[PDB]
Every structure is written in C-alpha cells, then in structure tokens.
C-alpha cells in the first residue's frame, strides 16, 4: 500500500510498445526530488505535463 | 634485392647469418686463455666448454657447462686467441 | 539421410544371414 | 533485544533468486535460526509468474514486516542464483526483492553474492545436443 503520488514529466524518451501506442518517459516529482522513475504513458503527452502514477515502485525495464 | 652481390658480401651479413648458411661455413666458437686469480698457469679452454673445467693440480673451478657458452667463475680473466 | 540407409542395409544383410544360416 | 539508541540488529537475508521462483529468506547472523521465509509463489496463484519481480516484491514486503516485529533492523544481503551445474545468473526477482527491502524501511549492509560454483561440474541435464526447441 502506497499513496497516490504525482509526477511531472521532465523529458520524453520516445514512443514505445508493440504497436507504438505507449510513450516511455522519465518523470520528476514536485514535492521531493529524491526519486526518479521511468514510466510508460499511453496517450498524447506534451513536454512538462503531469501524470498520476499509482504504484511508483516497479520500473519499466526501458 | 634484385641484383645482390653474392660473391662479396659485407662482413656484417656473414657474421649475422647462421654458421652453416654462410658462403664458407666457419664456427662461431673460439679458444680462450682462462687465468685463475690464485695460480698463474694459463689453460686453453673452449668457448662452449660443455664440461666442468678445473686447473690441473688445483681446486678452483674455471668454467661451468651451460646451454651455450661456458660461464666462467668470478675473477677468472680470459682472452681469445686466433 | 545417408546414415539411416546404411543402418537399414546393416539390418537387411543381418537377417539375410539368419535365413541363410538356418538352411544349413 | 534492548539496545541503546536503537542500534541495528543485523540479520542475514538469503535471496535464492532463481528462475520459476524466488526465495526471500531472512535468518540470524549464524543462519541456523530462521526469522522469516516467504517465496514468490506464496503471493501468487499462477505458476507462470512465481519468479515475477512483482511476486518477489510482495514477499520482500511481507518478510520485512516480520523482522520489525522481532527486532531486526538491518539485513546482510547474500544473493544466490541457481548455481552448481545449472545456470548461475540470478532470476528477475533479485533486483525487485532487494529493492523492496530497502524501500520497506529496512537497512542494507555488506551485500555479497554466494552462488554455488563448482571447481569441476558434473554432467548437466539435457543431452549433448542441448535443450533444443
């Protein structure tokens, strides 16, 4: 059990996935910058946007 | 090396090449006058002694057999002859 | 395969000796 | 175990991070006394993901709770793959179980890798033509 953490995308790494539907990006927290995790994103995302990841624990293995 | 003089080679090449592959074969060995530091008698010793050479009627050892040239004992001066 | 054709000939001439040794 | 200032009561965590399963085994310094042992298969019901990093993460969070109830504060990590005659690379549950322990409010110290390696192995399973598929 972990709290719903907010994260702001700092730089998009490009489109990923099988059919190219996901967008692997690296996020950056706003409250505490002592954690950096890469997360896949499914949908059109600009630069500097904010996503709401739930797990915030597991990686995506690039 | 298209026109090389095979009859009159420089002495640096004859000295460098193998003793059998020379124009006229000649041994790379010689004889030396090993002088024991204690005694005074001169004994002719082959370069590659191949045998433990000692002074006749003494105790000091002159040479030691090795793979190539003999290893003379310390202080045993020598000179080659021709 | 050529190694199995050799295996069949070995098993073919092996039973030929059986039907030939039994008639003597 | 009353310690002044609440010092770290060190334990030894044996992580058998092989394939098809992942053992998160926490013992004392001698290893003879088992504090808590939970595997990746104990947290999932499908046999295909017993070695999944998610299954090993849940086991690391469960074993970290049992250590706090008994007084263990720090853990000495001893990662171990299948080893021996078989493969010697840790499974996918190695990084997940180890990271989940550090994120579960536990202390990590003296990381090591004790994998059984032979000075001369026996004959491995599978013929000389290998597991072909």
């Amino acid at each position: 059990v972990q709290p719903i953490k907010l994260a702001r995308v700092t730089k998009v790494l490009g489109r990923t996935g099988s059919q190219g539907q996901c967008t692997q990006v690296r996020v950056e927290f706003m409250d505490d910058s002592n954690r950096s995790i890469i997360r896949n994103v499914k949908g059109p995302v600009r630069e500097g946007d904010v996503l709401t990841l739930l797990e915030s624990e597991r990686e995506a293995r690039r | 090396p298209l026109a090389k003089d095979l009859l009159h080679p420089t002495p640096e090449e004859e000295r460098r090449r193998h003793k059998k592959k020379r124009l006229v074969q000649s041994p790379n060995s010689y004889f030396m006058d090993v002088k024991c530091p204690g005694c005074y008698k001169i004994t002719t010793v082959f370069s590659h002694a191949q045998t433990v050479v000692l002074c006749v009627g003494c105790s000091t050892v002159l040479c030691q057999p090795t793979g190539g040239k003999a290893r003379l004992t310390e202080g045993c001066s020598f000179r080659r002859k021709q | 395969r050529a190694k199995w054709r050799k295996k069949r000939m070995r098993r073919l001439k092996r039973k030929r000796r059986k039907m030939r040794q039994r008639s003597k | 175990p009353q310690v002044a200032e609440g010092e770290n009561v060190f334990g030894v965590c044996h992580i058998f991070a092989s394939f098809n399963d992942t053992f998160v085994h926490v013992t004392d310094l001698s290893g003879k006394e088992t504090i808590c042992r939970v595997t990746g298969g104990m947290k999932v019901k499908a046999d295909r993901d017993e070695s999944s990093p998610y299954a090993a993460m849940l086991a690391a969070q469960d074993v970290a709770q049992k250590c706090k109830e008994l007084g263990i504060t720090a853990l000495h990590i001893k990662l171990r793959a299948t080893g021996g005659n078989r493969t010697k690379t840790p499974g996918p549950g190695a990084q997940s179980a180890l990271r989940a322990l550090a994120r579960s409010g536990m202390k990590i110290g003296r990381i090591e890798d004790v994998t059984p390696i032979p000075s001369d192995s026996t004959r491995r399973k599978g013929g000389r033509r290998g597991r072909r598929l």
Binding site: - | - | - | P1, V9, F10, L29, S30, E33, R110, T115
Partner: protein, 213 residues
C-alpha cells in the same frame, strides 16, 4: 498454535581480543524446555563476519568464521574457525593474459590446531613491459609455489593460534611471499584466500578465557 518466537531469548556473540570490535551481534534460541537446553544449541553456530566489522579500519573483502565455544551468562563467546575472501575479490583478481600460482599446506600450530592455508598469487606486468602476456615458465611456477609452502609453514608452525590470526588480519604472510618471490617472477596479488581448521584440540576453558580476556 503458540508462537515460536515467544521462547526465543537473545544472546550477545562476542569476538576474541584479536579484534577491536568485540561486540559482534545478537543470536536467538529457544529457552530451556524439555530435556534439551539452550547452551548446547548455541555451541555449534558459525558466524561469517567481514574483517571491516571487527577492526576499526581494515579491508572488507576478508571474512572470518567465528564458532561459538561457550555460553557464559547471556553472552556466548566465539573463537576463530576459518578465514575466507569475498567472491568479488577472488573473481576480480583472476584476469586473463597472466598465470595464477595456487598453493595449499597442512600445518599445525604450536597448539594442536591443524590448519589448511590456501595461497594464491598472480604474476605482475612490468611498467615498461610491451608484451601483452606475462606468463611464468613451469619451473618458475614451481619455485614460486614452493616458496609459498615454505613461508606459510614457517609462519604457522612456529606460532600459536592467536599469533596466526594476528598475522591474518593484516596479510603479512601474503606480503612476504610477494617480496620473497620477487627474484623469481614479480607477483601481483599474493593473498591467503582461505584457511580451513581441519582438527581442533580438546576444548579447555582456560584457553578460551585467555582469548576473550
């Protein structure tokens, strides 16, 4: 039904005076219930502890096995049982384009402690060496391996168990071998990778109290 950790009472393992950090850690065991007691269950535990956790500032790639020999009032005393290097240290020294010279002896100390020391040494590449491979001929390896066995025998047979451990916390036996074999072939990473305690003499309380005293 009942929780098994209700009967677990903690003991404090201690190290002999050969180390600086004497307080080693804690160990748990069930209380004395039934015919079995809690003392004999603690007299067989081995503790593989790194050297940096026993000395103030030393290397961390050298481990020490400490077996418990007696329990004296809630803290059980330990004794030297065996030395071993870290797998990371052993795999990092074994490189390519060089030779490794291993040697093992079976020497008993002044007291009846039969030890089996394992030495390992690698040839060192010269500073101005242009040739890639730094190999030693078989006869040079034999003289180096013979020198390892000659020094390890002299440094152990003429000392007691305490002095050998004091010669193992710093790898003095590894340094003199590297210096002795300098005339044969310059060695690089001479270490004593492992020390097995094959036979142990009759346990007496006076010898154990002399160590921890």
């Amino acid at each position: 039904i009942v929780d098994p950790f209700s009967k677990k009472d903690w003991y404090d393992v201690k190290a002999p005076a050969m180390f600086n950090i004497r307080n080693l850690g804690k160990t748990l065991v069930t209380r004395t219930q039934g015919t079995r007691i809690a003392s004999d269950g603690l007299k067989g535990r081995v503790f593989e502890v790194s050297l940096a956790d026993l000395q103030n500032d030393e290397v961390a790639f050298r481990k020490f096995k400490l077996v418990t020999e007696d329990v004296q009032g809630k803290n059980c005393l330990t004794n030297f049982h065996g030395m071993d290097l870290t797998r990371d240290k052993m795999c990092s020294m074994v490189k390519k384009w060089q030779t490794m010279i291993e040697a093992h002896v079976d020497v008993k100390t002044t007291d009846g402690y039969l030890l089996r020391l394992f030495c390992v040494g690698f040839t060192k590449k010269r500073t101005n060496q242009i040739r890639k491979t730094s190999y030693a001929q078989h006869q040079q390896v034999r003289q180096i391996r013979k020198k390892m066995m000659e020094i390890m025998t002299r440094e152990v047979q003429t000392n007691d168990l305490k002095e050998v451990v004091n010669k193992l916390i710093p790898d003095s036996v590894g340094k003199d071998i590297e210096k002795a074999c300098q005339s044969i072939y310059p060695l690089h990473d001479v270490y004593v990778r492992k020390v097995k305690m094959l036979k142990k003499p009759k346990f007496e309380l006076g010898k154990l109290m002399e160590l921890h005293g």
